[PDB]
Design a protein around this ligand. Structure first.
Ligand code: HEM
Ligand SMILES: [Ca+2]
Ligand SMILES: [Ca+2]
Length: 336
């Protein structure tokens, strides 16, 4: 172990510069360690940066992308042009300054900002953090980011190419437990994906499984589906993945335990963080990441709706027992 200049203890000397980054991010980028939009935007950024990786393209004789190389920042002029990266400009520019001021690679910074950002949201597990990703990168090839307009097969094949199994795709989606949409239906700006956009819990999995009965906005978006109550938005891909026979059972098992959800998401994230890199060549600085406040609330079926309102899509396995909250039907306020 080593004692950094600031007095912080750590396992490797290269972890020291990250305590300075931490203080910078928590005070400015996260405006006081808050769990709001900046956290949600960073989670989109980490996924979009990392997923630009394709062994299949490489085999075909084309550049497949360098994975979690920070290319979304270094080559933002190109990547921010992709329609899948809309609404990320201001966040990318803010992160660029931090990386330059502290002399850290953008690949590492994105991964670090993700771990730190989630510690600001109750219920979040403590994500692993590795440092050492090269600072140089090439822009990601286009069309590598799965979208809400893609079929389930198209999403599984894209993710599978990158190295993810169908169940790991479900595990990664736990991030939609801290989510809203701004560009799918601008009429209802920041309508949340689950009833607790500031709590990393299983509500996302439970609520997407409820029968869709409500149109939250004036019209139904291009990639929107009816949701369970006013104010909540339901993305087409999320609704389909929860019901598809290839992903249904895993989705169903993610409803009953915040504990289990957290572990799987953390393992899946660790895998995504090294796409395009060799983990053995990186240094572990996970001890710099703070713990998030605990979430003691139990999972519930909200609004007086019961388990009978769930569209069980994996009947071959028992549907777990989940608490039920009395009515009335809630009306969600936009995510902060
Ligand atoms: C595997 C298929 C996935 C699809 C098709 C998908 C699609 C989308 C779309 C279209 C939005 C709304 C963006 C906007 O209008 O603001 C969104 C939001 C969001 N997604 Fe995903 N997503 C996927 C996975 C993920 C993953 C793997 C992560 C990260 C670990 C992630 C994190 C988020 C978050 C936190 C938001 C909220 C952003 C906000 O409130 O500003 N998503 N996603
Ligand atoms: Ca990248
Ligand atoms: Ca939530």
């Amino acid at each position: 172990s080593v004692t950094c200049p600031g007095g912080q203890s750590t396992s490797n000397s290269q972890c020291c510069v990250w305590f300075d980054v931490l203080d910078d991010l928590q005070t400015n980028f996260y405006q006081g360690s808050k769990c709001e939009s900046p956290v949600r935007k960073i989670l989109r950024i980490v996924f979009h940066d990392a997923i630009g990786f394709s062994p299949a393209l490489t085999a075909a004789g084309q550049f497949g992308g360098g994975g979690a190389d920070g290319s979304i920042i270094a080559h933002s002029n190109i990547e921010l042009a992709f329609p899948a990266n809309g609404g990320l400009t201001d966040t990318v520019e803010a992160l660029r300054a931090v990386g330059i001021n502290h002399g850290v690679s953008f690949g590492d910074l994105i991964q670090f900002a993700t771990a730190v950002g989630m510690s600001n949201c109750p219920g979040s597990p403590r994500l692993e953090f590795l440092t050492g990703r090269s600072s140089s990168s090439q822009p990601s090839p286009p069309s590598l980011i799965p979208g809400p307009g893609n079929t389930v097969t198209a999403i599984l094949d894209r993710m599978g190419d990158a190295g993810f199994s169908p169940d790991e795709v479900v595990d990664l989606l736990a991030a939609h437990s801290l989510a809203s949409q701004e560009g799918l239906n601008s009429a209802i700006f920041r309508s949340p994906l689950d009833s607790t956009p500031q709590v990393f819990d299983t509500q996302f999995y439970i609520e997407t499984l409820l029968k869709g009965t409500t149109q939250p906005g004036p019209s139904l978006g291009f990639a929107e589906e009816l949701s369970p109550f006013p104010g909540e938005f339901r993305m087409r891909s999320d609704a389909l993945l929860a019901r598809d026979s290839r992903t249904a059972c895993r989705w169903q098992s993610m409803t009953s335990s915040n504990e289990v959800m957290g572990q799987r998401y953390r393992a899946a994230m660790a895998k995504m963080s090294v796409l395009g890199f060799d983990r053995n060549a990186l240094t572990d600085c996970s001890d710099v990441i703070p713990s998030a406040v605990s979430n003691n609330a139990a999972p519930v079926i909200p609004g007086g709706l019961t388990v009978d309102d769930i569209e069980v899509s994996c009947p071959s396995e028992p549907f777990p027992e989940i608490a039920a909250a009395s009515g009335p039907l809630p009306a969600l306020a936009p995510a902060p």
